[PDB]
Design a protein that fits this description.
monomeric; binds S-adenosyl-L-homocysteine; MidA/NDUFAF7; alpha/beta; Mitochondria Complex I; nine-stranded mixed beta sheet; transferase; 400 residues
Amino acid sequence: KYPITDFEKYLQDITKVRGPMSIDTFIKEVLTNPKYGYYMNKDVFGKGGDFITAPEVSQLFGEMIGIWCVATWEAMGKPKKLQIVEMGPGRGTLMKDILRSTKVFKEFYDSISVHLVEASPANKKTQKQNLLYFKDKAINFDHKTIGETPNGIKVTWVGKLEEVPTDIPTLFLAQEFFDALPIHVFRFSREKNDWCEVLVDEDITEHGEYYLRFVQSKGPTLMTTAVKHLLPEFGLDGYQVELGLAGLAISQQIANRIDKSGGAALIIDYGYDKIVKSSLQAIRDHEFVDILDKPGTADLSVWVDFQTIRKTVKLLKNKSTAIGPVDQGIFLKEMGIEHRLAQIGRKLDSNEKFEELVMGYKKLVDPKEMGTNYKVITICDKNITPIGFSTSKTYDDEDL
Ligand SMILES: Nc1ncnc2c1ncn2[C@@H]1O[C@H](CSCC[C@H](N)C(=O)O)[C@@H](O)[C@H]1O
């Protein structure tokens, strides 16, 4: 029943002055608020720790993504200068594997610089410690936003995608980035015969279980109207959908960058090839808990709607398209992960470590693990056929 947290008073205050906030604003606050945000504040004080993600399972993952970067660079026409952008790099482990594994491709390696987009100073710090070669001391950690890898590759940190240079061919990597973006939640009302938005308000009822509560907008909000052409037209009463508008905006930026200067994006996450009705989850101490249970104290994740991403891109009607999704297992095998598995494994010649390597491979590709839950979609030029998407479906209805 009790008691009220510092963050729940700040969030209850927003609702008093501005009225009930969106799920989007709510998640934006819980994750990215200074000083209460789940990222930046707490669960770090070092290299995170709780980062159990695909790159952290196996160098195999990073190496396959690296082969993809090189193969895609080849299909683009071996541009002399190439940007590699990672959205939400985490510890930097994925990027570290890529830069380690792609060094042998001399021509490729000489054309690349890296741009990491990252909002958390703590994750920024971990990424830099890792990845960077420090030649002299007396580095000012935040003011100097650029550094150099031990192999001389240039890495620049930025807070938003918008700050990355434009008019240079660019690869974009987003791995467990989209599931941490804010979403809006919409619900159909027969009474209004229109969509309403689920909002977060005060809870000052008698038996108010958590201080905050899920309310519903009266009329259709700005956001409902803005996205109405992506919401199902057919609506039973109370029918409810999540939409990651933050991610759609990012998808549009990427699609347009590719349209202007060329490139390709690789978006990897757990999600569905359909609109997602309900997925927003809050985990804490290895248990699922209520989204409104001490907000800030639990990690909020979403399952990614790959379908709306794809449509949203295509709806720009320029040189970019979106191909996918395909299952992570199918993608990784199609990139040659089993060849690398046996190449790396042959070198280990320690049998207990070999089993370690295989188990991480199984986690990545086996359907009962990450193999099917995780999926891959690409944003790219219509003219340049992507690498690793031979199993992608053709969506004849959406292609006009
Ligand atoms: N709105 C936003 N803009 C930029 N970075 C963000 C963001 N929201 C979250 N992030 C960052 O994205 C990452 C999400 S966690 C995923 C980390 C890494 N990809 C891995 O596989 O382990 C974190 O580094 C977090 O700080």
